[PDB]
């Protein structure tokens, strides 16, 4: 839709150029700056909506309709070690691309330009002008939106890695000498009387009908390890 609106505007501008009116390029430039501010505000709204959708608290709503593909991860048990089929770093990388996606859809727009007949700039159109890559600096709210966006990801990944961390702690069940525990807690309250209690609580994140823990667009699936 942005593409069709802009190219229609470009056709109308070319039609203006068909006739002879003075100071056309400067008028085109002022129009471009106005477009820049308007689209920057729209970009800020869209980024805000993207942050809301990612963070989970979320016909021409300014933000739009963000949609992030579910990033699937698996706890692989092969080689008697808890693997991440996509490594935890993936859980961030993919999100970034998604976030990147939600920008190009509004950032890769062709810039309205008078060069259609103003061939006086006989030079290959530079990328940072031909594609209108200045929107982020036209933030109505300042860079705060970006500060928010990454923050969400920074949260979403970080703590969910913590979740993964909890799962990884179970590694000991295959490589751990019970003699160590016995010596450490020989003759406790009676024998352990404490860790035999916290183990029951440790049965959390586990022994539940849930098979894959969803969290926003990141789903960590403990399917292979469940049994």
């Amino acid at each position: 839709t942005f593409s069709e609106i802009l190219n229609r505007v470009q056709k109308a501008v070319d039609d203006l150029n068909l006739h002879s009116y003075s100071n056309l390029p400067i008028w085109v430039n002022k129009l471009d700056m106005e477009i820049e501010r308007i689209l920057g505000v729209r970009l800020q709204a869209g980024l805000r909506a993207w942050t809301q959708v990612l963070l989970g608290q979320a016909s021409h709503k300014p933000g739009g309709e963000p949609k992030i593909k579910n990033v699937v991860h698996e706890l692989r048990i092969t080689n008697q070690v808890i693997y991440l089929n996509p490594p935890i770093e993936e859980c961030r990388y993919k999100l970034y691309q998604e976030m990147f996606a939600w920008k190009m859809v509004v950032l890769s727009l062709p810039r309205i330009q008078s060069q259609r007949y103003q061939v006086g700039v006989h030079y290959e159109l530079t990328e940072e002008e031909k594609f209108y890559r200045n929107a982020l600096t036209r933030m109505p709210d300042g860079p705060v939106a970006l500060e928010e966006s990454y923050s969400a990801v920074m949260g979403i990944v970080s703590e969910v890695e913590q979740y993964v961390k909890v799962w990884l702690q179970y590694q000991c069940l295959w490589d751990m000498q019970a003699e160590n525990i016995y010596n450490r807690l020989g003759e406790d309250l009676n024998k352990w009387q404490a860790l035999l209690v916290q183990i029951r609580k440790a049965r959390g994140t586990f022994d539940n009908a849930e098979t894959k823990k969803e969290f926003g667009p990141v789903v960590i699936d403990y399917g292979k390890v469940q049994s």
Partner: protein, 311 residues
């Protein structure tokens, strides 16, 4: 509770991870191209602001798989606050930072480089690292610098942030073209190499030329990067012999090894300002045509009032 002790103490063999390798460079310096080609893909996608590349390091000698975090930063200063996402004091002790001086534009190197010198510096203090840890990291890096074997001085590490630092300069092949197209003197190459060596010395940095087009030192880049962030075995000597591609290990550089480079150029003394020696690239795009404003009715009418009155 008791578990998180008992289970945790049962630790097995492993390899250190969670390293945040950082990249700052002047925008459009092909930094993404370098980082991707180093990672293995020819080139990912660009964008704005921070980007993430999980660099996959495999040690065949121990046969293990680990991932470091290439955190490539956009060059626009307005995107500097998001650098607070890049480095945290939890991540700081193990962060390795590099610059990408696109040698196809020497005119902007030191400026851009010095821009680094400001930005990171501010960010490393705006986070209020306690002086004890900053000092201990600083001295640890100093000792690591001093014990090079394939030093001391007045300006050695005279201003450094105590974390390993490189200066990788890409598009090395371009030096050929700008040599012929710009009549760029070889003495200019020696001068910029000397000035960069001085900078990397005062920051205790290891400089490496590279050219993705010539896939030159890319293996060497990977080798050094792993050797620094992890501590793998290193064996490549101080490749400084030819000016086409030079590798300076962090510690190899000596002020006398810079004096010898001083000797071979005798056109203009190195002490002069950087931009003075190098030739500025003139702007090509023409200024847009001046506004053809039309005299409005009011002052035109008073002028005509004068014209009639004179009659």
């Amino acid at each position: 509770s008791s578990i998180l002790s008992e289970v945790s103490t049962r630790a097995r063999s492993k390899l250190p991870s969670g390293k945040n390798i950082l990249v700052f460079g002047e925008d459009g310096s092909g930094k993404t191209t370098l980082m991707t080609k180093l990672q293995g893909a020819e080139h990912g996608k660009k964008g704005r602001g921070l980007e993430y590349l999980y660099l996959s390091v495999h040690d065949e000698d121990r046969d293990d798989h680990t991932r470091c975090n290439v955190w490539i930063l956009d060059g626009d200063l307005y995107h500097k606050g998001l650098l607070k996402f890049a480095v945290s004091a939890e991540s700081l002790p193990e962060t390795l930072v590099i610059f990408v001086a696109d040698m196809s534009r020497p005119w902007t190197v030191m400026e851009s480089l010095q821009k680094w010198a400001s930005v990171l510096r501010e960010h490393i203090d705006k986070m209020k690292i306690p002086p004890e840890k900053m000092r201990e990291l600083e001295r640890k890096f100093v000792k690591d610098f001093q014990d090079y074997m394939e030093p001391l001085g007045d300006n050695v590490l005279t201003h450094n942030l105590g974390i390993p630092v490189l200066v990788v300069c890409t598009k090395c092949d371009a030096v050929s073209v700008l040599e012929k197209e710009h009549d760029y003197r070889d003495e200019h190459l020696d001068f910029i190499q000397s000035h960069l060596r001085r900078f990397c010395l005062q920051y205790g940095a290891a400089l490496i030329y590279t050219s993705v087009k010539e896939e030159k030192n890319l293996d060497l880049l990977y080798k050094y990067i792993v050797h620094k962030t992890y501590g793998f075995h290193f064996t490549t000597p101080a490749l400084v012999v030819e000016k086409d591609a030079v590798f300076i290990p962090a510690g190899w550089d000596n002020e006398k090894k810079i004096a010898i480079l001083h000797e071979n150029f005798t056109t203009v003394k190195p002490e002069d300002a950087y931009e003075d020696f190098i030739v500025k690239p003139p702007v090509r795009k023409l200024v847009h045509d001046k506004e053809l404003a039309a005299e409005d009715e009011q002052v035109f009418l008073m002028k005509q009032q004068s014209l009639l009155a004179k009659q």
